[PDB]
Amino acid sequence: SKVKLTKENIVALLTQGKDLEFNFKTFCLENLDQIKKMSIISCLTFLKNRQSIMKVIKQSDFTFGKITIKKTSDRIGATDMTFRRLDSLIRVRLVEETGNSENLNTIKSKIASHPLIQAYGLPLDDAKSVRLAIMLGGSLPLIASVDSFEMISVVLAIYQDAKYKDLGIDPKKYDTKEALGKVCTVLKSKAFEMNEDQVKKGKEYAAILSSSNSVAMEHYSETLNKFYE
Amino acid sequence: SKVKLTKENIVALLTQGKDLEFNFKTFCLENLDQIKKMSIISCLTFLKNRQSIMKVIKQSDFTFGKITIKKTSDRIGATDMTFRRLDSLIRVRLVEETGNSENLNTIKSKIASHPLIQAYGLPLDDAKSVRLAIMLGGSLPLIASVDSFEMISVVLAIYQDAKYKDLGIDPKKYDTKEALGKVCTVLKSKAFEMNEDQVKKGKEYAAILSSSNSVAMEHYSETLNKFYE
Amino acid sequence: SKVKLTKENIVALLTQGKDLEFNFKTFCLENLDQIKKMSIISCLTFLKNRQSIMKVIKQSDFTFGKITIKKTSDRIGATDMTFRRLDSLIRVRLVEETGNSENLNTIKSKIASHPLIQAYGLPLDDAKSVRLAIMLGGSLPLIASVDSFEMISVVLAIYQDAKYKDLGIDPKKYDTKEALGKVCTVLKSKAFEMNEDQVKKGKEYAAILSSSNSVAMEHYSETLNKFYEMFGV
RNA sequence: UUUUU
Secondary structure, eight states: OBOOOOHHHHHHHHHOOSOOBOOHHHHHHHHHHHHTTSOHHHHHHHHHTHHHHHHHHHHSOEEETTEEEOSOOSSOOSSOBOHHHHHHHHHHHHHHGGGSHHHHHHHHHHHTTOHHHHHHTOOOOSHHHHHHHHHTTSOHHHHTTSTTOHHHHHHHHHHHHHSTTTTTOOTTTOOHHHHHHHHHHHHHHTTOOOOHHHHHHHHHHHHHHHTOOOHHHHHTHHHHHHHHO | OBOOOOHHHHHHHHHOOSOOBOOHHHHHHHHHHHHTTSOHHHHHHHHHTHHHHHHHHTTSOEEETTEEEOSOOSSOOSSOOOHHHHHHHHHHHHHHGGGSHHHHHHHHHHHTTSHHHHHHTOOOOSHHHHHHHHHTTSOHHHHTTSTTOHHHHHHHHHHHHHTTTTTTOOTTTOOHHHHHHHHHHHHHHTTOOOOHHHHHHHHHHHHHHHTOOOHHHHHSHHHHHHHHO | OBOOOOHHHHHHHHHOOSOOBOOHHHHHHHHTGGGGGSOHHHHHHHHHTHHHHHHHHHHSOEEETTEEEOSOOSSOOSSOOOHHHHHHHHHHHHHHGGGSHHHHHHHHHHHTTSHHHHHHTOOOOSHHHHHHHHHTTSOHHHHTTSTTOHHHHHHHHHHHHHSTTTTTOOTTTOOHHHHHHHHHHHHHHTTOOOOHHHHHHHHHHHHHHHTOOOHHHHHHHHHHHHHHTTTTO
16 A cells, blocks of 8 residues: 655656655754864854865765765765754854853954855844854754754844845745744744743844845946936 | 867867857657556655655656656756656646546545645536646646647646735745746747637636635744844 | 865864865956957857857866866866856957957847847947847856946846846846846946946947847737636736 | 756
């Protein structure tokens, strides 16, 4: 009767005449210690050169220490390490280091030069503003499952959904609406309740995002519109 | 004078100074017989689990029998088999079986549980409504090239443009206006004329379409909108 | 201190505790002389069969003369030659040859049969209209960096943003708003100032683009709107 | 013409 959806069952589906019918929080706690031996600067460098580093990881089977990032994006186990999972851990680690003030001055100084931080025009004032900076460009639904990261993920997802045009995010490459949906799905999965305290924290995050800011098309906007008309 | 486009002729073109100059309807007839050895239920299963199957087919060079679907999306020949072309054939196959009364009851029963049929709220009464059900989710411009499928393709395309909001179709992923245009290009290419007989058929389809009718975000929606403003 | 981005350096980044950190105008002037030995017909043929020629170059490491277009799209140097960089230069060569009247009639005659010219319905009357014809399908932000090519690039970019639907430009394949943005970034980078003389020229370009001429949907529109009104439109 | 719902 009914079988499991496998690659062979799809082949059999097409070639026979027979009737045929068909948690990251845990991952984080177990793999965070492994990357803790990285440097704060090493973490910020990974973030700073994410896109460039990503290309190198995807060239072939990238193995570092006991961990290996497979070339096959398909079939990834709860133990398996993807680039997104590696990228996310490093951000979670950096936020944890925001609990120490000495690291906060290191991160705040260095992350102020990051490409994404300037594009968002993010004001880097207090600890919450620095934490947001670490979040920029990160896999929000993944990070949202980690405790105390629920609000910071959804506020940034909302911001990315509202201002996707201003941030220059291509909707064809990144569904900014789908991302927010998955974040909410994550929170409901771990029965996250949005009481006033969570809303209290989120608005403080949103306050930083609100105060944040093409620049070239604005420089020629007065003469560009005459041709437009 | 004029020469053939070859790799060497481009080298001569760039390095010398001498003057140098250089249909799914068919696809269906040739590949439909191949998938006819499938079961009626197996076809309906493919439709029901299209998205799930889609991911698996795109995993690697998917080969079933003598046919192989390549991973390389670029450079696809008129003979080459894509997932959408496979999907289209199976729907065309299923519609052909709507000419049999035994199959009509079989298809009608199974496809009533399909996700798209329920989302559209499509009433499955007569043969034409069942045919519409099979069409849901299909590559309309492809199917439009097959004879007698012109009206059912363009009428459904028209409907998707009118009720795109009600159907929950994301404009960023699917240009619903562009879709209707591509269907018309196919029809105009084979000189299809919408006389009284054809428009009559379409109106019968349109009558059925007229009578037709995220979750995690709804949970946090009340507190979510505050950040949106 | 700072090191080069290599596969080994990423491993060191992730497994160790050490502190670890990682213009076409010039390109044109240095590479334009090389393509000058081509024929006008050779240049115009390249324009006519761009997509078909493009695929052959992408087949393998395509080498012509001392120049080689590598298959590896990643890591392209300021000296390295890509197809888009190759294609744009050929257009630049062709536009420069519009300053001579003999070539002007040759280009006008040949390029009038080219796909983009016919699809855009571009009227080929004077020299400026001919220059516009050569630009169609070209890499605008690259060419915009070449001097005297600034206004003609941004005016056409504006037009491509406004009429992207009528021109059959696929938004999933080509962000026509991003295109206009990149051109402006180039112009602001070389401090291009849009004074009265430039805008005057641009409007002459824009006038030609205005004068140029879904299509298949209008053919059925009489019996296409009858169904729209059934669905409440 | 290719791709996603």
